């Protein structure tokens, strides 16, 4: 559920998604992370 948090990689965005919406299905876009479920 897209945030104003930053990423380096998608693989990394997952970690952020785990502490966001307990998921590993995130994507990194313009050094920002977007997550699912």
> What radius of gyration do the chain's Cα atoms show?
8
Outline where the chain has alpha helix (H): 10-21
Please tell me what DSSP assigns to residue 22.
S
Query: In the chain, what are the domains?
Result: 1-37 (3.30.30.10)
Please tell me what DSSP assigns to residue 5.
-
Q: Is the distance from CB of 4 to CB of 24 less than 8 angstroms?
A: no
DSSP-assigned beta bridge partners for residue 32? 29
Q: Cα separation of 21 and 35, whole Å?
A: 7
* Token duo for residue 9: 């990689």
Q: Is the dihedral of CA 8, 11, 15, 20 positive or negative?
A: positive
Q: How many Å is the maximal CA-CA distance in the chain?
A: 22
**What does residue 35 show for φ and ψ, rounded to 5 degrees?**
-125, 165
């Amino acid at each position: 559920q897209f945030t104003q948090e930053s990423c380096t990689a998608s693989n990394q965005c997952w970690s952020i998604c785990k502490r966001l919406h307990n998921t590993n299905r995130g994507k990194c876009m313009n050094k920002k992370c977007r997550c699912y479920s």
